[PDB]
């Protein structure tokens, strides 16, 4: 039994959302083996913090108009779906955003709280285009993994959905980009020891090191099942 156990030898926040990470030392072929699995696990398994709710100051449906605004309501939903946030020690929360007068809107405008985190305050939100114009909307956030369509969600909830509450599809994954490379680096002052590098892009909601360790832990759960014969 000659295996040297790899370790997350280095981490790199190359960008505030894009990160690099490397694992070493790795036995022959294992880098490819772990690399494929870890890539697959991360994309599917990672737990996400995402928004699915819209409460608005008087419109009644996705297709409604709005006074003194640059865009239609539905386009607002698309922007919100793009928006992402991280929440501290919570499962769900409601946020609100209020603006008035002629101006464009950004995530920073939200009624932020210290126990909530906005990954990109500069993220674009629909604009106001009248002096008397004003917006005051409320949105709820949830923790989940994977994706869910809006229609399926309500049918599972089955409780009355009041008018003025609008539904959007949940896209939880905190990250969607994976590239990993296997390279030879020097351990045991000899060849045939492998070095692995991973890199990914994220919406910033999670720490990359937590991602790999959380993913690896998850994979261990399924792997342990094979001992249960």
């Amino acid at each position: 039994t000659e295996f040297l156990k790899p370790r997350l030898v280095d981490i790199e926040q190359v960008s505030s959302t894009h990160a690099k990470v490397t694992l070493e030392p790795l036995e022959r072929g294992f880098g490819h083996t772990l690399g494929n699995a870890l890539r697959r696990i991360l994309l599917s398994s990672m737990p996400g913090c995402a928004v699915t709710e819209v409460e608005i100051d008087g419109v009644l449906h996705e297709y409604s108009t709005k006074e003194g605004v640059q865009e239609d309501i539905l386009e607002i939903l698309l922007n919100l779906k793009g928006l992402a946030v991280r929440v501290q020690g919570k499962d769900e929360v409601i946020l609100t955003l209020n603006k008035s007068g002629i101006g464009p809107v950004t995530a920073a405008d939200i009624t932020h709280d210290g126990d909530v985190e906005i990954v990109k305050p500069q993220h674009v939100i629909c604009h106001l285009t009248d002096e008397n114009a004003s917006i005051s909307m409320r949105i709820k956030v949830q923790r989940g993994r994977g994706y869910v369509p809006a229609s399926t969600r309500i049918h599972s909830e089955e409780d009355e959905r009041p008018i003025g509450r609008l539904l959007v599809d949940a896209c939880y994954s905190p990250v969607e980009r994976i590239a990993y490379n296997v390279e030879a680096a020097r351990v045991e002052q000899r060849t045939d020891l492998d070095k692995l590098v991973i890199e990914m892009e994220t919406n910033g909601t999670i720490d990359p090191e937590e991602a790999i360790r959380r993913a690896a832990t998850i994979l261990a759960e399924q792997l342990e099942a094979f001992v249960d014969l």
């Binding site: 890539r39 969607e176 590239a179």
Partner: protein, 50 residues
């Protein structure tokens, strides 16, 4: 025979499902049948799936 009418409109949002008809401009029509976990798709060395 009738002396009052009401008109109602209903809006439907539709995604893509197997059996939908898809076409490329170059006469290349075809129906789609699958939805894959994004992991399955072939991807380039730059980590981008198709």
């Amino acid at each position: 025979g009738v002396l009052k009418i009401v008109k109602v409109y209903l809006a439907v949002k539709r995604r893509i499902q197997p059996g939908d008809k898809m076409a490329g401009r170059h006469g290349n029509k075809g129906v789609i049948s699958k939805i894959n976990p994004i992991e399955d798709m072939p991807y380039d060395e730059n980590g981008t799936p198709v």
